[PDB]
Subunit: 139 residues, 4 copies
Amino acid sequence: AYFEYRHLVTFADTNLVGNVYFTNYLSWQGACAERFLAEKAPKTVARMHDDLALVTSSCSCEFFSELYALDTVSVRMSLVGIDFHQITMGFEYYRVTDGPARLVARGEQTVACTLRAEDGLTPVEVPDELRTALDAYAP
Amino acid sequence: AYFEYRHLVTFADTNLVGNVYFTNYLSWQGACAERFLAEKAPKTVARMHDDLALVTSSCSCEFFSELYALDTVSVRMSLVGIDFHQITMGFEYYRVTDGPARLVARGEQTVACTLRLTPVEVPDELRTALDAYAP
Amino acid sequence: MRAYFEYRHLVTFADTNLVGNVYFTNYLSWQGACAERFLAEKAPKTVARMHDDLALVTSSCSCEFFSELYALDTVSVRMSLVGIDFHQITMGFEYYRVTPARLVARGEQTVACTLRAEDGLTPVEVPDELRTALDAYAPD
Amino acid sequence: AYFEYRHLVTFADTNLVGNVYFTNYLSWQGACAERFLAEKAPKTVARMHDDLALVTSSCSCEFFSELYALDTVSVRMSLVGIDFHQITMGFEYYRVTDGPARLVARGEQTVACTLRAEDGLTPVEVPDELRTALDAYAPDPHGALRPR
Ligand SMILES: CCCCCCCCCCCC(=O)SCCNC(=O)CCNC(=O)[C@H](O)C(C)(C)COP(=O)(O)OP(=O)(O)OC[C@H]1O[C@@H](n2cnc3c(N)ncnc32)[C@H](O)[C@@H]1OP(=O)(O)O
Ligand SMILES: CCCCCCCCCCCC(=O)SCCNC(=O)CCNC(=O)[C@H](O)C(C)(C)COP(=O)(O)OP(=O)(O)OC[C@H]1O[C@@H](n2cnc3c(N)ncnc32)[C@H](O)[C@@H]1OP(=O)(O)O
Ligand SMILES: [K+]
Ligand SMILES: [K+]
Ligand SMILES: [K+]
Ligand SMILES: [K+]
């Protein structure tokens, strides 16, 4: 059980070493999670037009093998854990360019639900719609 | 007269060809203009904390020679044109070293002034500040 | 008639800035993504040469922004051939919010074909495979 | 002692939430480490023009409070450890916009020293120049008081 985001690696993704610069693997976490939100949490998305902000509280990534321009990466997001305030998502990154998929990296991101206020951010509980949509991607 | 922004070219700035990916030259236009606002237009920057949004209406850039990681680029901003609503900035990009500065790129950006968008006229403080860099 | 090659993108939070719209350089990044997908699909021998000494480098670009894009919009980037000379290719881009289609931006990029030679990048004739593939997206 | 990278936060650094998009904190790790190489490890930089590639093997960051456009961030790098071919750097991020530093984030990155071969990356020993340079930013010994 995972939510998948596929990405053709661009020239912009690369750096002078010839591989994908490491921060792009973290960017794909947000792209993957945002696609999940659009497809599975429409009410939460509507609240993010008013005052609701989902913000990263931590993230991590481990890099096992290089990706190159014109590789295709499959980013697979699953639920590591959830409580009343925060969500931890796990990510596996597969090269799917040709042949069976090969794991090239792993990572994680924890997000907190907050209200946007003038003087900072106000933690709130995970919206029910989000919790329900995420329980499908659990172990 | 020009307003100068300097940047050590990072690994992230590069791509697999080995040079600076073209969009970063445009990014530096914003970084340069921001530095200008902070130093020269505090009232306008203050309004930009509230409802004033300076939005790009067009940009361009010409790339004459490569930049590489660990080069230092000097981005030099001048005023190309201004009317009641919009501002066009010119940018020259120099590779700087202990030798003579070498022109590697040149570009332009036009910004419109808006309130969150509703167009509004260029703030006076901003017009005054920019004329210091007019031809 | 002129055909276009389409690249679609779901606008991400990373694409946005504090104003809430898409930061302007991303429209230019989409020109590269769109062109690089065209190459993969339409010019394989050229791509293979790009594993060696062939480097396609931007010589100029431009974009003009008509209406805002926001996170979770989908943009359709439509690329056509504006012109080709011996060493250089100019591609035109129209950007539409789709997420009928509503025009939001329009831009251009010129790319030089080069080989990385002893004394720097050196312009080279547009490879025949790439000339022929691009011609499918030129005026009729 | 730390190695400092200072950055004026740009509009490009921000996102719709109004704060700095989280990946930029990681990008500053690279920019900081690069500036360190440019100032402190010229032989290593020269060999990187040959075949030496320093590649990220892991990274992490935790975000305690927001940064906004026109903030100035102080990114402070220290050496956590070195193990044969890998260097682990620690980063603390401070808002310094209005004078007194305030902690806003903390992270870490491990880099592997490698040589590029036709068949891929091969780990190689950390260059002495780099080891010595980074040791200037290593904390004093701090050992458990635990009799065995
Ligand atoms: C001052 C500084 C200046 C600063 C320096 C510059 C600052 C940063 C600049 C930007 C640079 C980048 O963006 S570089 C782009 C991002 N990074 C990458 O692309 C690096 C990708 N990783 C790799 O190429 C490689 O893993 C290396 C080279 C890091 C390590 O080589 P290796 O030791 O031969 O590799 P390998 O055995 O396969 O993998 C390492 C370990 O990963 C784990 N591992 C591997 N495969 C798997 C797997 N399928 N499932 C689980 N775990 C796995 C195992 O523990 C394995 O150890 P064991 O099981 O063998 O014991
Ligand atoms: C479908 C496709 C797939 C799509 C392809 C893939 C999509 C893009 C992927 C991203 C790629 C990048 O980001 S590449 C990174 C960004 N681009 C660059 O770094 C390229 C830098 N530019 C250059 O290296 C060069 O200009 C070249 C190689 C492009 C052109 O070579 P050239 O024609 O031999 O160069 P040169 O004569 O020295 O100068 C170029 C021209 O610039 C002008 N010029 C030069 N210097 C000056 C100067 N100081 N002041 C004024 N003008 C000057 C003159 O017109 C000059 O022509 P003349 O007066 O001398 O006759
Ligand atoms: K994102
Ligand atoms: K900017
Ligand atoms: K690209
Ligand atoms: K970097």
